[PDB]
Amino acid sequence: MPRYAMAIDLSLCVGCAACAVACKMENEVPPGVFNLWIREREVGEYPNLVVEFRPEQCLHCENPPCVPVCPTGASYQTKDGLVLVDPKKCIACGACIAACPYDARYLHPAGYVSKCTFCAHRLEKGKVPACVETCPTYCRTFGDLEDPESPVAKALKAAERVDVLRPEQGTRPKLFYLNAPSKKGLTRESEVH
Amino acid sequence: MPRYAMAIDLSLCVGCAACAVACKMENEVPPGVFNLWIREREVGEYPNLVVEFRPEQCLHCENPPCVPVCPTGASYQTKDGLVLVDPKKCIACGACIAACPYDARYLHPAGYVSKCTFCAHRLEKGKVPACVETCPTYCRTFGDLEDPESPVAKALKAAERVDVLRPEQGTRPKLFYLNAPSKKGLTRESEVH
Amino acid sequence: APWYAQEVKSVYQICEGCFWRCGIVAHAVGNRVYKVEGYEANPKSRGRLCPRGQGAPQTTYDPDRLKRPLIRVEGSQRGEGKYRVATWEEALDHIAKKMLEIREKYGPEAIAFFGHGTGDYWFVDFLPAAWGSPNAAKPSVSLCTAPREVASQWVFGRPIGGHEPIDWENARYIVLIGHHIGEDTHNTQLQDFALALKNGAKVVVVDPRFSTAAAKAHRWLPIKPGTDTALLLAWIHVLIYEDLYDKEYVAKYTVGFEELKAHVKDFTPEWAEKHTEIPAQVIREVAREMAAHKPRAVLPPTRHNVWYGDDTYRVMALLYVNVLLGNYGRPGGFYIAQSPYLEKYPLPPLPLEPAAGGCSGPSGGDHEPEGFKPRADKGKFFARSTAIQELIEPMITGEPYPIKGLFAYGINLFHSIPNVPRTKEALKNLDLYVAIDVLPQEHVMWADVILPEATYLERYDDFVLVAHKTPFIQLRTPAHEPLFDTKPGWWIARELGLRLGLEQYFPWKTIEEYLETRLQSLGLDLETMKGMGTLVQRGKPWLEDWEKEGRLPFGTASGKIELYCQRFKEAGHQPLPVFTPPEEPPEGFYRLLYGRSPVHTFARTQNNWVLMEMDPENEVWIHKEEAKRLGLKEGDYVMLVNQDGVKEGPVRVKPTARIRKDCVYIVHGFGHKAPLMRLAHGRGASDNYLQTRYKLDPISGGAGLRVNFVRLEKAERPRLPSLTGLAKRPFDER
Amino acid sequence: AEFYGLPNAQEFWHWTNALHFVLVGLAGGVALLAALLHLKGDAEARRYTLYALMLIALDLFILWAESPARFRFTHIWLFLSFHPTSPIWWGAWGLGLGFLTGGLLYLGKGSQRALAWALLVFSLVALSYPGLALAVNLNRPLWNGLMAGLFPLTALVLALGLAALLKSPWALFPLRVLAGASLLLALLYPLTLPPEARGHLLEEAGFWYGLFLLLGLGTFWQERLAPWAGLLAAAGLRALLVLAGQWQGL
Amino acid sequence: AEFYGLPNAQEFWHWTNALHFVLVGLAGGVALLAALLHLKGDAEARRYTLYALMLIALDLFILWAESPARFRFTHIWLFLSFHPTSPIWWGAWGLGLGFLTGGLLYLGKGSQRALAWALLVFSLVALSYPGLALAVNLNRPLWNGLMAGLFPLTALVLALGLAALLKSPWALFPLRVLAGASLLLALLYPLTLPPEARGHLLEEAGFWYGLFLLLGLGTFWQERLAPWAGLLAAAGLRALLVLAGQWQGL
Ligand SMILES: Nc1nc2c(c(=O)[nH]1)N[C@H]1C(S)=C(S)[C@@H](COP(=O)(O)OP(=O)(O)OC[C@H]3O[C@@H](n4cnc5c(=O)[nH]c(N)nc54)[C@H](O)[C@@H]3O)O[C@H]1N2
Ligand SMILES: Nc1nc2c(c(=O)[nH]1)N[C@H]1C(S)=C(S)[C@@H](COP(=O)(O)OP(=O)(O)OC[C@H]3O[C@@H](n4cnc5c(=O)[nH]c(N)nc54)[C@H](O)[C@@H]3O)O[C@H]1N2
Ligand SMILES: */O=C1\C([C])=C([C][C]=C([C])[C])C(=O)C(O[C])=C1O[C]
Ligand SMILES: COC1=C(OC)C(=O)C(CC=C(C)C)=C(C)C1=O
Ligand code: SF4
Ligand code: SF4
Ligand code: SF4
Ligand code: SF4
Ligand code: SF4
Ligand code: SF4
Ligand code: SF4
Ligand code: SF4
Ligand code: SF4
Ligand SMILES: [Mo]
User: Fold this and answer.
1) Number of folded domains in chain A?
2) Any idea where the domains of chain E sit in the sequence?
3) Angular region, B144: left φ>0, alpha ψ -120 to 50, beta rest
4) Is C212 close to A14, i.e. CB distance below 8 A?
5) What's domain E1-250's superfamily in CATH?
6) Residue B64, SS3?
7) Is A118 part of the contact surface with chain C (CB cutoff 8 Å)?
8) Does one domain contain both B8 and B54?
9) Would an 8 Å CB–CB cutoff place E86 in contact with chain A?
10) Among E63, E76, E81, which residue has the most ligand 4 atoms within 8 Å of its CB, making it the best to mutate?
11) Are the beta carbons of C497 and C127 closer than 8 angstroms?
12) Which class for C251: exposed (0-12), middle (13-18), buried (19 or more C-beta within 10 A)?
């Protein structure tokens, strides 16, 4: 019934990869695959140099292309907006990886697809995700979008600007990048070459 | 040598179609068509009510899809970045209309296709475009993007954010919207209902 | 199957990820700490942790980690890697045997003790002093911090210290000279910096590289390297000559500024601009801007200060700017950090007990005839601190006097000390070489008897006390017992203490006993601390707390500006004029630079798969146009050859534009040549190996490192084992 | 939501042009038939060439009679320039040259296999350009890549459907194969669209679409309904995509 | 441009899932031949029905064989859930019911030629699903709408290529017709992509692409070159599009 979301204030992200490492430890994400990674890109030229540190992970899209594509039903979207995988039904076919626009998904070496989980295991015990917890810069917030006391909600409200990766896709990413450092918004590779 | 552009500050635009009427007048744009129009969209409920007034007209895309698709060579991009039509070659096939992602062109009743000209007629004689001159709010700026002194260059430099319509087509518009009212950026019909 | 829906045991710990020693909570399931977390109530981590802290646990579960003592196979050459497994007993006897031989032939001072880490209290500060060697050194002094500690001891009479006392939260204007925060991922500092960004604080980063901190800055001054002092002097000049400084602060807590004004007379924003390449106007503007925010404008001194070799001058100058903004001891700049009270274990005095900074009778009038031989680097620079890179010359020329026998406790000899060939030569020449430390790293293999030391999560370490607003104490309990034939450092020091007849210094049989005795002073018992972790004490932070009390904190009476008497009296001119134009790189070279990669803490983290996975190699930063002129592109690898011909393994080329054309930048700590650290092994380039030279700071012990130049030769992309494949080797607890 | 003035988002290609679209399909595909016939040395190659010429003429005539610049006489530029990136330019040259090539074939002048391969190539240009005239407009969500598949296959169903009405014996089997292909791709077409575009196609059309899908199924039923059904499905589908795909829509 | 960690942008369907793509082309294409041969009464309806059962089975084995989830036996869920939005799901049943159906047809029992209608339907589902399993991912620029057309056309080129090598008289002509349709759409495909997607395609594959296009032109020459040359072209393109389109790309 809530709408779970994550917001990352890029004006504060320094791209240390603490969240990324906290994730790997917590979810014991195996070598070679990542639920979370950082992307750092410069937009350039001296008087006007801009570096965007951008942590990427499952955005737990509100309209996830990775769910519909699943034949098994292992890819499901939860009532509060978490896209999760039930590995019991996963036939590791990769359809969801093909349909995920963000590279958030991987084949776990145990034979099923995995990806960030919004720390489902913690959310139920009433805790905040591990990446949100460890963040030194206090740039990531989390919570229920609909609860205005939520740290995501308040941050979205306080943001000077809010962006999302590949909005043009159908998805409605529920991971919001707040104050994007470049005036043109989130950095894209096509805008480089 | 210049790379011509236009910058419109949306934080100042009030959607009084002055520019739209000035162009209608200056360019004798016949009745049912328009090189320039204003779109006005509201975003949001009570305590966060934003209204975006947005003039729309040829963006004189730098990578104009409206040019390659033209069979005759009527549709052409100038060395300074103006997208124009040599009516003498225009067969009014409408290919350029099909290709323009911005509803910027029309079939003029004289038998050829027309659209915002960046007031090439005025540009050539050293004047600024009609829209730019008649504008109570001074939100539009024009100039050579390459000249750090030009009004557009300055405008862009001083902008809090810069946006462009449908950036994901890859047209590289040269009509920049500054300081869009909504945190999420330029308004799209898709983010409605 | 997930560690968290299974057995967990959660101890309060202390991170040995770096020396910030963040207080953490360690969660183990069996003998494997799976997650570590910061905890509020610990002023350092306050619930958060940096990447390295989160991944730090892996070393314990590193296959490659050291497991049992080892003794160099007699007859084999130190270079070679032939060792035989020894018993803790046989190793400790072998060491005590050799040490006493050296003692009874050369004296104790002929054994040098190099160390780093929490355990370095045993192997650097206590045990060598019990044994009477003054040649105990940490790289965090002359390879990092020494210029700023000397400068800070001269100017206030205090240390900047481990957890530097910048009142980040109330700062309104922060000027960073170097200080690549965000890359330097010291936990509380990043939190404090983030917070200050959040509260609207404005940041100015002075640095030839557009670094992460510059990415968050309102002004980036891409200063010409080695030119910072010129900038700072021009700031002192705008602050004084435009009369923007805090007069009463100057008038009441300062002594001697009537010397600074005259000194800086010609050090103009136009003079500075010539050298600096920062336009006079921006120079003037920044000075005015920090003045406009007076006592909430700070120029927090950076930590690694050992650049160029005239570094104490640079720090002095910068500390004067702070004084001139009258920010020291006020909200918004620096608070006064007081050490916490925790009584030492009662013991007889040590043969040698040093003083660390407080001077007036610094080195000369304080080291000579009293214990016995002086620190072997005693006359090389003015300051009394021991300079690690200055104690390895005796190892070779045997000059001042011979240094036979060297201990290397958790200290990278080939990565942390410049001039690796010299260090290697020094090792061969040794009668004894010991290497205590966790994984197998090039320098450890060169030892005569290696000692695996219980990982921070497996041992109890004597309390950590951090001077701070609020003085606190930390305690690390072992989450699970040592693995393999591994031992805690306090235990190794105790045995090597008993074996050398220093039993009076180690009258306590156990560390729990040792900790309890100490804990007893603060009506506290060990069990109790184990449930708290961190015991935070009061502490005075602002000048007003001192003053309303009748006292002021400093050295001699007040803050000496541009002063310190016995230097000007004898040995060296007093102020920072030494803007002294750095020697510029030869043609075809760049001035090597170096820094930190958020995920990695010096070179000891390359074999960590969790962390290597985030950053498997370093990358050389060269300007886009420079890279374009050389013929390099984004996919390219290159060898960096320094001015002395040393070549460093292929490193990826990063053209990307955040650097002057003047420079090149590589993260420190890569380029290991340690086949047994299977992941670390042949990746990236090592700056230390290219840092064949250094310019010694005559004042502090500093090894000025940014004085090396490097050239790029194209190289083939390297062939390396798959890191994931190596990451997957399971950890066999045996 | 509200405007002052209006964006020029009105239909630029009318029923008139959709007709051109159905016709150039016929034209091109009959020119392919004539080419392949000349190539098998089959006797019918001659009149199929006349037809491909007629349909080429009929198509150029309505391309011109429907052009707002019909009396400005600017189409000459179609032929005095080189615009390889433009489908309509390709289309002008394919048909045009395909009409000369097929003109000489008819008049037994200027060679004859080398003219039949030419007709083959120009008729592939003409069969190919319509779907691409649509498909290159990546701003129009309905004119996706499949248009480059739907238009060529559909132009074939038109030609073969015609050939079969004219009782040519060879064609009622290819007509069913190609009509099966076209209808399968036409059925999977909507599933190839982003939700909003499919929903737009379904709202604005569909029922017509779905009717054209059913219709075309009669190409596999009764012998003499088969070409009509195939013709109307293929033409209905072509015109409907042309009219319904002129949408930029967000 | 620089990362700490890495996006999981690694190939997800490897050369083995490109191999299955080729076989399910065959499996579905032949299953179509079979049902049509049934429906048509043809003597060969049996020969081809037991082939399609092998091809189908070979594929379903390769489908499980290549799945990292094989020894976890999770495929049973492919058949115990309703997931109409999922191309792959539709192919599980299309090949599953297509199997049973082809069993009940080969074992001449249960029912006759009402079952060939079911086999026809299931084969269309099996012919349709890969093509859509790719095109459904609107985040993959290369896998555009044409995949939904290029795969079924190409699967029949495979089925008819096989059929023609097992010397069935009927197979050559339709193989050369669908091979022409296949090859022409395959040629138009690049022109359908946005410039960066096309550029990616030409640098990543292309040669390979232009090779298989050229190779496929071999269906229109000799015999026992023809079925081969069209068969390698169809499987080339199929495997290459699966391999080259796993790009997300900006
Ligand atoms: N060239 C160059 N030199 C430098 C620097 C530089 O950037 N460039 N940085 C300088 C700075 S600022 C500093 S602070 C110093 C850092 O100096 P160091 O601490 O020397 O650097 P590390 O590479 O961290 O190596 C420490 C060693 O301790 C081992 N170790 C880790 N944990 C433990 C433990 O629990 N017990 C034991 N016994 N050993 C352990 C590691 O394996 C490693 O060998 O280096 C200085 N030296
Ligand atoms: N991840 C991580 N973080 C760490 C550590 C770690 O090992 N890993 N180690 C910690 C330790 S002990 C230390 S000492 C610190 C080290 O970090 P700091 O104390 O921040 O070191 P600095 O040299 O001050 O800053 C690095 C920057 O100095 C710049 N620099 C180089 N030359 C010049 C110059 O001439 N003028 C100026 N203004 N700038 C210049 C470089 O371009 C670089 O971006 O970080 C600590 N934090
Ligand atoms: O195919 C079309 C052609 C070929 C032209 C112009 C050419 C001639 C020979 C009259 C068009 O104008 C047109 O649009 C009406 C075509 O289809 C869109
Ligand atoms: C990607 O191609 C396919 C899969 O991925 C391996 C499947 O799992 C499945 C699952 C279904 C069965 C019948 C084994 C099908 C049908 C398929 O086509
Ligand atoms: S903790 Fe913040 S700054 Fe660090 S990687 Fe995560 S989002 Fe980026
Ligand atoms: S890999 Fe698993 S979760 Fe993903 S689509 Fe296949 S069955 Fe579903
Ligand atoms: S980001 Fe990708 S994997 Fe995550 S929910 Fe959205 S579509 Fe699925
Ligand atoms: S929410 Fe949990 S799983 Fe997702 S990135 Fe953060 S720690 Fe990892
Ligand atoms: S004239 Fe100015 S205010 Fe009026 S519509 Fe144009 S930009 Fe907006
Ligand atoms: S309508 Fe005119 S300008 Fe547009 S493509 Fe046709 S000829 Fe060119
Ligand atoms: S705005 Fe329209 S006319 Fe201008 S370049 Fe873009 S598509 Fe062409
Ligand atoms: S620039 Fe010219 S075409 Fe554009 S709105 Fe102004 S007058 Fe009209
Ligand atoms: S600063 Fe980071 S790496 Fe260092 S001890 Fe603290 S958490 Fe560990
Ligand atoms: Mo340091």
Assistant:
1) 2
2) 1-250
3) beta
4) yes
5) Formate dehydrogenase/DMSO reductase domain (1.20.1630.10)
6) coil
7) no
8) yes
9) yes
10) E63
11) yes
12) exposed
| Alpha carbons C421 and C414: distance in angstroms, whole number | 9
Residue B193 counted as domain residue: no
The answer to whether residues A120 and A51 belong to one domain is yes
Task: Give the largest CA-CA distance in chain E.
Answer: 64
* Element housing C702 (H / E): none
CA distance linking residue C133 with residue C373, whole number of Å: 8
Same domain, residue pair A85 and A154: no
Give the range of the structural domain holding residue A37, as residue numbers without chain letter.
1-63+116-187
Kindly give, in sequence order, each residue whose CB lies less than 8 Å from that of residue E189, ignoring residues fewer than 6 positions away. Answer: D145, D148, E146, E150
Q: Which CATH number is associated with domain C143-348+541-575?
A: 3.40.228.10
Question: Would you say E122 and E53 are in contact if contact means Cβ atoms under 8 Å apart?
Answer: no
Which one is the CATH code of C68-142+384-455+480-503: 3.40.50.12780, 2.60.40.10, 3.40.50.740, 3.90.1750.20?
3.40.50.740
Rounded distance, CA A193 to CA A64, Å?
28
Q: Which of these, A7, A11, A31, lies nearest to A19 by C-alpha position?
A: A7
CB A117 within 8 A of CB A59: no
Q: Which atom of ligand 10 is nearest to the CA of B99?
A: 5
B80 and B41 within one domain:
no
End-to-end Cα separation, chain B, in angstroms: 44
Query: How does C515-528 read in b/e, with b if 16+ C-beta sit within 10 Å?
Result: bbbbbeebebebee
How far CA D68 is from CA of B95, B107, C391, in Å, comes to 13, 8, 92
Spatial CA neighbour of E38 closest among E92, E117, E129, E151: E117
For C207-285, list the strands marked E by DSSP.
Answer: 219-221, 254-255
At the second CATH level, the architecture of C576-734 is Beta Barrel (2.40)
Q: Is C176 in the pocket of ligand 1 (CB under 6 A)?
A: no
Give the chains touching D; criterion: ≥3 Cβ pairs < 8 Å: B, E
Are residues C346 and C311 in contact, defined by beta-carbon separation less than 8 angstroms? no
Lookup: tokens for B61:
């895309």
Helix residue ranges per DSSP H, C85-227: 88-106, 120, 127-130, 139-140, 146-155, 187-198
How far from chain centre, in Å, is Cα C287? 30
Q: Which amino acid is at C663?
A: C
d(CA C549, CA C537): 19
State the span(s) of chain C assigned CATH 3.40.50.740.
Answer: 68-142+384-455+480-503
Asked if the structure places residue B192 within a domain, the reply is: no
Check whether residue A52 and residue A147 sit in a common domain.
yes
Give kind and range of the element (H or E) at residue C724: helix C723-728
Enter the tokens of residue C587.
């043609």
DSSP designation for C222: -
Q: How many angstroms separate the CA atoms of C326 and C544, rounded?
A: 13
Q: In b/e form, how buried is each residue of C350-368, taking b as 16+ CB within 10 angstroms?
A: bbbebeebebeebbeeebe
Annotated binding site of A: 13, 16, 19, 23, 58, 61, 66, 70, 90, 93, 96, 100, 116, 119, 131, 135
C663 belongs to an annotated ligand binding site: no
Cβ atoms of C436 and C486 within 8 Å: the answer is no
DSSP one-letter string for A15-83: --SHHHHHHHHHTTPPTT--SEEEEEEEE--GGG-EEEEEEEE----SS-TTTTT-SSS-EEE-TTS-E
In the block, tokens 């100042």 appear at B12
Which 3 state secondary structure label does DSSP give B7?
strand
Q: Which residue has the tokens 């120009």?
A: D122
Domain presence at residue B169: yes
Residue type, D170: W
- What is the spatial distance between Cα E103 and Cα B172, in angstroms, rounded to a whole number? 58
